[PDB]
């Protein structure tokens, strides 16, 4: 362990041992000082045009965090191919990190003149929330994960948390946590970091579509031994007169069999279409959205329960916020045209899951007699029945991988909303931070802490390996499948690849659920 | 009790359904309830029991 | 009794998790908007469960 | 304090003020019991089951705000279906990244537990 | 504690209809017994308040 | 008439907690009073002035 | 300029009461304020807000 | 013992014991 030697070697690869597949990136990071070392309160309450629904109350805190919660950040798109094309499920194993090459600088603005220097005797500070004692910030879709070419510098978010408020102010309850007061290593420029994690227990993603519909599971050359009421009126003219009439049903009327099983709840959305001619005019964008109401604050339901993006034909209806909404490159952050993001679909959920933006179905709604008739009334709002069947929504390979499980009493399927494993011992929050140097110190006692500091950063290599486990596929279709291919008429540039100026590109988001299978 | 019903078919207008990709289908039987309340053996869900057909019985209507 | 000779709880607590139990729990579509349609949102005033709900249990006392 | 004992009854089907056929009737004497005299003693034992502890705490954070206030997201969410420009607003698509200042409309993995709305009364 | 005799060592139907004014919601049958039984689900029975003073300050579950 | 006694084996989850500043505490009041809480009158009746809950220390989602 | 770590080891003589009342105990005020007691301000700066005895708990002469 | 090593961690922290609470912080 020397300044002269290295302390570790550039590992990016991926290998397949069968239902084994063990992906290994490196990048490179850049570290600034946040908030000159200090801690700060940050709020904002109902003042101003804030309303009442995004006040907040918390601290910004000196520290900086890693984050790979996101696919992308382990598997090229040829191996995202690799996978998504043969293997109906996966899921993670094991997961190892490091850290090594750290090199600190420090700079000196003198009038104009900007110097860079090494400063061989500062250290960083590094630990892991090994016991989930801070709050659970990732799981978010925060920016500033690994960026996806390996040939990219990036730099370290900073970290920040939020507690309980009443307005701008805190209650009796809000929590306050000091970093420094968790045992951490110090490394210089010679020493390295590293630890392993081991997940839990968790199902396959369920990587394909289903090639039967819900409601056409049964044979369709044989009745049902059962029947149903296939009429109360009598047969014969403009005299019909009250009677109970019943038939099995068969093939031609398959709608009216007698089934087992259920759609997966819902809560519908509004609908809107990419023809901008076919919309209301009038700016419903979040008038019209559906929210949710706690402790007197509303919240925008997004992107919500798993539900089929559209019924057949109507690929150009989507649901107001039931969508993963992803940008292009060098997409704006505030209020851009809809011809720079991506939308995505989740359309292969037909077949169990309903319609976003249409009713469940439709209900009793009174007792009919001989002088009342019935009447029935949409649901637009199903909870879980027995019975019920439903599929989670898809990944996405520029989209989250995991998030945490909040600890509580009570639970019901806990799967992440925006798609991915739901853990409740995730894997653990990794925080770092420059060591302060004080600048020179007066030549006489102050009780008065110090305040200035040498600038100074810091940099250096990253690595994380993860071993996942695959669940073959084991069809028996005789027809062909259909397989996520890249197009084969010349471009002006190759998806997935760099400009004329070196600048990555994503063009489109990629699903997994491409190969079949019956229900 | 035939008068006791609206005199109108409703067997399939009135019938509680599911919307799914655009197609909807009888819910039946449906979510195990109880037939009816004390004293009401006279009355039943319309798609909400079990129907079996009795020896030799015909196939529609 | 009168009500000054009865001693009320709390649950005040859950306020982070569990929906106020006075209020409708959010509020959801109600048709297809369209160019000459306004969309249309309706109360949720009971609501089951659903994938992806937490939930915290009522306290005991002594 | 000196208590008083309760006195044991209990419940079956019914209709109205009658019995039906499920009705059941129970009589205590038809069990093994033991009789005690003045000097002798009578105790046992039992074992819970496996149960989970209850939650003696209280959550220092809500459910609407576990996100970092400090960053935003990648992800986008409709912002507005109009036209910013004046009276004469057109159908758009109009999108953004929610962040520290529209934490209302960040894309959130949880949501709130069922609800069964009743009346709400003041003192 | 102390036992006193109930109904005279007699089991007894018990019930209440429509009767009366009586709603329907409010009908029940059943019987009452000569037999006492002991409760203790609750609690206070088991606890000191200074007890459950040091229980619930210092712990997150039991 | 005779005596009775129970006894139950509780077990506890004790606190894990890296919160920094004070936490809520439940206490009884410091300021004087004509009687004592959860104790007894002039004439031995014993009372419970108020409900008390087990939610007061804190926790992270 | 440098680091510095101290470490103490400290006895404890846990209270043995039988005291049937609940004790006075050192609790945060429960009503919402602009700052949390010892925690920083938007500034960074700490501070305490009262002093901190250590007589609580209650033992007979 | 080299220049480019540290030669020592953050500890700052308490644990409880039972009779004993150990209690250790480091400054700059």
Not at 158 to 175: D, E, F, K
Not at 254 to 262: G, R, T, V
Request: net charge neutral.
């Amino acid at each position: 362990d020397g300044v002269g030697s290295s302390s570790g070697n550039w590992h990016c690869d991926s290998t397949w041992l069968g239902d084994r597949v063990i992906t290994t990136s490196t990048r490179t990071w850049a570290l600034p000082t946040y908030n000159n070392h200090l801690y700060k309160q940050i709020s904002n309450g109902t003042s101003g045009g804030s309303t009442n629904d995004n006040t907040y109350f918390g601290y910004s805190t000196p520290w900086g965090y890693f984050d790979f919660n996101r696919f992308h950040c382990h598997f090229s798109p040829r191996d995202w191919q690799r996978l998504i094309n043969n293997n109906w499920g996966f899921r993670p194993k094991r997961l190892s990190f490091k850290l090594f090459n750290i090199q600190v600088k420090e700079v000196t603005q003198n009038e104009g003149t900007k110097t860079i220097a090494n400063n061989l005797t500062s250290t960083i500070q590094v630990f892991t929330d090994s016991e989930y004692q801070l709050p659970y910030v990732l799981g978010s879709a925060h920016q500033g994960c690994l960026p996806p070419f390996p040939a990219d510098v990036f730099m370290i978010p900073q970290y920040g948390y939020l507690t309980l408020n009443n307005g701008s102010q805190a209650v009796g309850r809000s929590s306050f946590y000091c970093l420094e007061y968790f045992p951490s290593q110090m490394l210089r420029t010679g020493n390295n970091f590293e630890f392993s994690y081991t997940f839990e227990d968790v199902p396959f993603h369920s990587s394909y579509a289903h090639s039967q519909s819900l409601d056409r599971l049964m044979n369709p050359l044989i009745d049902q031994y059962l029947y149903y009421l296939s009429r109360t009126q009598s047969t014969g003219g403009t005299q019909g007169t009250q009677q109970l009439l019943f038939s099995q049903a068969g093939p031609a009327n398959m709608s009216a069999q007698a089934k087992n099983w259920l759609p997966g709840p819902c809560y519908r959305q509004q609908r809107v279409s990419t023809t901008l001619s076919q919309n209301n005019n009038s700016n419903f964008a979040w008038t019209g959205a559906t929210k949710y109401h706690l402790n007197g604050r509303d919240s925008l339901v997004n992107p919500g329960v798993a539900m089929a993006t559209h019924k057949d034909d109507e690929e150009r209806f989507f649901p107001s916020s039931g969508v993963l909404m992803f940008g292009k490159q060098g997409a704006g952050r505030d209020n851009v045209d809809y011809s720079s993001v991506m939308l995505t679909s989740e359309e292969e959920i037909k077949t169990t899951n309903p319609v976003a933006t249409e009713q469940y179905g439709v209900v009793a709604d009174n007792l009919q007699q001989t002088n009342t008739g019935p009447i029935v009334g949409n649901v637009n709002s199903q909870g879980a029945l027995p019975g019920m069947v439903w599929q989670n929504r898809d990944v996405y390979l520029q989209g989250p991988i995991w998030a945490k499980i909040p600890h509580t009493d009570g639970n019901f399927h806990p799967s992440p909303l925006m798609g991915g494993f739901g853990l409740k011992h995730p894997p653990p929050q990794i925080l770092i931070k420059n060591t302060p140097v004080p600048a020179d110190p007066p030549t006489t006692f102050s009780q008065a802490k110090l305040a200035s500091f040498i600038t100074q950063y810091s940099t250096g290599q990253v690595s994380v390996e993860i071993e996942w486990e695959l669940q073959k596929e084991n069809s028996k279709r005789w027809n062909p499948e259909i397989q996520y291919t890249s197009n084969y008429y010349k471009s002006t540039n190759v998806d997935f690849a760099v400009n004329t100026e070196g600048t990555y590109s994503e063009p489109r988001p990629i699903g997994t659920r491409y190969l079949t299978r019956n229900l």
